[PDB]
Design a protein around this ligand. Structure first.
Ligand SMILES: *[C@@H]1O[C@H](CO)[C@@H](O[C@@H]2O[C@H](CO)[C@@H](O)[C@H](O)[C@H]2NC(C)=O)[C@H](O)[C@H]1NC(C)=O
Ligand SMILES: *[C@@H]1O[C@H](CO)[C@@H](O)[C@H](O)[C@H]1NC(C)=O
Lengths: 438, 104, 49
């Protein structure tokens, strides 16, 4: 046997799936989603960390001259100054009063520690989804992990389940993201080779082990003060610390739909959106013959109490006449109300009780017990507690049944007005026809 | 290494109609944040230094707040209002208006 | 109410009856330690002051 249905993608919301085929007793399936994870495919662009500046000891030449050649090194900056008079604790350094030359140079290299501490830039693509689903029926109660993409298939108790694909393709990450420790940020970053000093991306590297580095930090040297030995230099501070200071608001406290963001690997969990279609193939060993199952005749339904709340704030009583005691499958055939239990026990007494949850003021739904069906309509009152700590356990429906008190009132008003209008039309037609007869 | 940090004091909660009021009594400057689980979230976060009171909206979809270093706490709002939904017509319309104003 | 004025009250200065509401919740001690943890709203008298 083959079957297909759709379930809501809400973690913790029970689903009752009713499967009926002629010649076999109806079956009810309990399906729940315990966790869902959405992970995108990434392509690393670059990483960033703090830097350091290497300034080797300056070169001093007495009664001579020096000239420096360029070198392939990140932001190498060299200069030669004339007319310098170095001093130290022992006294003067050279004979020549004004024939000394000082050669200075400096460059920038990545921090020796920033292997542990770095921030990565990534580009986001289409994301795949995986989930964990709990299935209950008969003596089978098991939790399995599946891929919600329409390809992976699982087997439970000789039954084949196929999940997905998801109805709505929605992702919280934009095209470009930045990852640091355990937070992600949906921000645009400069492309490689075009970093600016003082902002994010002052130094760049293809990967953590790269031997190349692109830096732009405005290394400017200056002439040393007279009678001293030192290499002055002015340079804009590291942009990584600046970005760390005013990064902004992380996605963990801004992501919509109330789903949580985790890293290593980057993923979003419990993203409540859309609905999941499920297809299933069942064997013949999971059903029961009509002869073995009890027979229910003359089924009628009465409601006892109804208060539309988050929990199961509604109780009703079902009366029946049977021939032998046993177990039956109970289901609600409308989305307006949701039942709590799927299997009930029937005895010769002919009375059973059921609990249900609803949201509409005046719900009306068909309840099925084994092979028999009945209709139920109820009058409900709003609750009084304002804030509760558990999630809603009902599908949000508010439109009442046509038999509700308010709809009955509007129907009666419209009916009276329509009858009056029809009377006016008939009177005018009769008058004009009588006038035309002459 | 593994590094030890205290847990903030539990705040005081007072309920209301689609609103909660939190009394916060910090001992150190602490980070307090909150968000809504809807389509467009009204995220907010701030540093608290002295004892203060705050008002947080809780729509029918849900609210989540993070205080100090405790786990985030989630809350939901039921469909509550005043007026009888099975009485005279004016009570009917007033109750439904309590549910949703613009549509009614 | 806890945290505000009048969290503890006494009918007089020498009374023997007292009414207090400060939400004295306990907690499980950390493993391998000897102590008693408790979380309590600060005195509302100081807050009012
Ligand atoms: C010792 O000191 C004398 C300075 O008295 C140095 O002589 C100078 O050499 C440079 C290099 O050719 C000339 O430009 C200067 O004109 C010289 N000065 C004088 C006063 O003649 C000499 O080079 C020093 N020797 C060493 C080994 O350092
Ligand atoms: C199904 O199994 C899980 C795991 O042991 C258990 O928590 C749950 O209560 C079971 N369900 C029923 C209806 O026994």
């Amino acid at each position: 046997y083959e079957h297909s249905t759709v379930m809501p993608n809400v973690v913790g919301f029970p689903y009752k799936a009713h499967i009926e085929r002629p010649g076999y007793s109806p079956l009810t399936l309990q399906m729940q989603v315990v966790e869902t994870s959405l992970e995108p495919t990434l392509n690393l662009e670059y990483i960033t960390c703090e830097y350091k500046t290497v300034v080797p000891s300056p070169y001093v030449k007495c009664c001579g001259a020096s000239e420096c050649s360029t070198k392939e090194k990140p932001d190498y900056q060299c200069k030669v100054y004339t007319g310098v008079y170095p001093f130290m604790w022992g006294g003067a350094y050279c004979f020549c009063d004004s024939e000394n030359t000082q050669l200075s140079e400096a460059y920038v290299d990545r921090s020796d520690v920033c292997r542990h501490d770095h921030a990565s830039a990534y580009k986001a693509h289409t994301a795949s989804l995986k989930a964990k689903v709990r299935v209950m029926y008969g003596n089978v109660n098991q939790t399995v992990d599946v891929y919600v993409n329409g390809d992976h298939a699982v087997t439970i108790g000789g039954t084949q389940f196929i999940f997905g694909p998801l109805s709505s393709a929605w992702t919280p990450f934009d095209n470009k993201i930045v990852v640091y420790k355990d937070e992600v940020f949906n921000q645009d970053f400069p492309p490689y080779g075009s970093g600016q000093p003082g902002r994010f991306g002052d130094i760049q590297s293809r990967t953590v082990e790269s031997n190349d580095l692109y830096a732009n930090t405005a290394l400017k040297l200056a002439r040393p003060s007279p009678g001293m030995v030192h290499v002055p230099y002015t340079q804009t501070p590291s942009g990584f610390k600046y970005w760390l200071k005013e990064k902004g608001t992380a996605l963990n406290t801004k992501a919509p739909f109330g789903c949580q963001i985790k890293t290593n690997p980057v993923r979003a969990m419990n993203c409540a959106v859309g609905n999941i279609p499920v297809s299933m193939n069942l064997p013949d060993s999971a059903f029961t013959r009509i002869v073995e199952a009890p027979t229910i005749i003359d089924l009628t339904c009465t409601v006892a109490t109804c208060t539309h709340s988050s929990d199961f704030g509604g109780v009703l009583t079902l009366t029946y006449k049977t021939d032998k005691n046993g177990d039956c499958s109970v289901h609600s055939h409308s989305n307006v109300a949701t039942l709590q239990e799927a299997t009930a026990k029937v005895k010769t007494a002919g009375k059973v009780t059921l609990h249900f949850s609803t949201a509409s003021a005046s719900p009306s739904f068909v309840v099925s017990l084994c092979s028999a069906r009945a209709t139920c309509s109820a009058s409900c009152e709003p609750p009084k507690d304002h804030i509760v700590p558990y999630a809603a356990s009902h599908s949000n429906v508010v439109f009442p049944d046509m038999s509700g008190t308010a709809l009955s009132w509007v129907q009666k008003i419209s009916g009276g007005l329509g009858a009056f209008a029809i009377g006016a039309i008939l009177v005018l037609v009769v008058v004009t026809c009588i006038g035309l007869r002459r | 290494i593994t590094c030890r940090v205290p847990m903030a004091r539990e705040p005081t909660v007072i309920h209301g109609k689609r609103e909660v009021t939190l009394h916060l009594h910090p001992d150190h400057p602490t980070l307090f944040s909150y968000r809504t689980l809807g389509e467009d979230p009204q995220y907010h976060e701030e540093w608290v230094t002295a004892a203060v009171e705050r008002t947080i909206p809780v729509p029918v979809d849900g609210m989540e707040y993070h205080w100090g270093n405790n786990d985030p706490v989630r809350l939901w709002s039921q469909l509550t209002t005043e007026g009888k939904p099975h009485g005279w017509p004016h009570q009917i319309v007033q109750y439904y208006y309590g549910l949703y104003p613009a549509a009614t």
